[PDB]
Enzyme design. Structure first.
Site, PDB file in Angstrom:
ATOM      1  CB  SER A 191       4.254  -0.673   4.208  1.00  0.00           C
ATOM      2  OG  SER A 191       3.700  -1.067   2.958  1.00  0.00           O
ATOM      3  CB  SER A 193       5.537   5.506   5.890  1.00  0.00           C
ATOM      4  OG  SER A 193       5.868   4.904   4.649  1.00  0.00           O
ATOM      5  NE  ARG A 226       1.368   8.355   5.178  1.00  0.00           N
ATOM      6  CZ  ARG A 226       1.872   7.491   4.313  1.00  0.00           C
ATOM      7  NH1 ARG A 226       1.957   6.210   4.609  1.00  0.00           N
ATOM      8  NH2 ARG A 226       2.303   7.922   3.143  1.00  0.00           N
TER       9      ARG A 226
END
Length: 237
Positions: A46, A181, A220
């Site tokens: 993404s 992300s 993350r």
């Protein structure tokens, strides 16, 4: 050098292989448990919504104000989205629609023109960033988003500005965090991304790590913020 040591000890408890790259426009720096990841190509997943939005806006296939309407097929994604809203929600179907509007011929020539990763899209115009064959190194990602921050990518300045602000996450005083992300689940091994930059002067960054089913989805971002704090690039309030 204790700054470097502090960052390294963060990764010490992280079992997953990880690299974290920074770029300040002069120096590339590398941290984490497997530094060779910095020069390994992975699917962008993404994080590819940055380039997709740029190409789309540049080639008049969407505007930043246009609403991509839900088609009624369940996917929190079950609603209408602007590209900006879809960017932060990481709404894949919205960006798949955008890719379909661009089409394989334009997508291919645009990726070649800007030199994005290995510039390979295969035969499916709305899958290549999720399943390959498009790959890009963390170093390539950081240089890419660095140029975006500076408006120095080969796109119209207004297009770069629009996409830049779609990435806006938070500010701390006068310092601004932009980030996106990614989680490539359809590849083996799976890859996790957190790429962006801090605008103080700009410091671009890319977390790139191995993922596995069941992993904490928030790790993350938290890991990245912890690192940026330790580096003094983006101190916690």
């Amino acid at each position: 050098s204790i700054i470097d040591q502090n960052v390294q000890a963060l990764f010490n408890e992280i079992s997953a292989d990880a690299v974290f790259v920074t770029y300040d426009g002069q120096n590339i720096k590398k941290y984490g448990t497997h530094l060779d990841r910095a020069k390994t190509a992975y699917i962008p997943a993404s994080t590819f919504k940055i380039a997709n939005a740029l190409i789309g806006l540049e080639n008049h296939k969407a505007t930043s104000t246009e609403i991509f309407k839900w088609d009624g097929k369940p996917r929190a994604w079950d609603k209408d989205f602007t590209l900006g809203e879809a960017m932060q929600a990481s709404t894949v179907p919205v960006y798949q629609e955008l890719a379909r509007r661009i089409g394989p011929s334009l997508m291919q020539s645009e990726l070649q023109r800007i030199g994005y990763g290995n510039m390979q899209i295969g035969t499916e115009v709305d899958q290549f960033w999720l399943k390959g064959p498009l790959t890009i190194t963390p170093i390539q990602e950081v240089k890419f988003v660095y140029d975006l921050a500076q408006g120095q990518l080969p796109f119209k300045p207004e297009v770069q500005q629009q996409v830049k602000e779609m990435l806006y996450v938070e500010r701390r005083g006068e310092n601004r965090l932009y980030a996106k992300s990614g989680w490539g689940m359809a590849v083996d091994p799976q890859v996790g991304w957190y790429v962006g930059f801090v605008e103080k002067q700009v410091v671009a960054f890319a977390l790139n790590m191995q993922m596995k089913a069941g992993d904490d989805i928030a790790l993350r971002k938290q890991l990245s913020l912890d690192v940026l704090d330790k580096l003094g690039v983006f101190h916690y309030l």
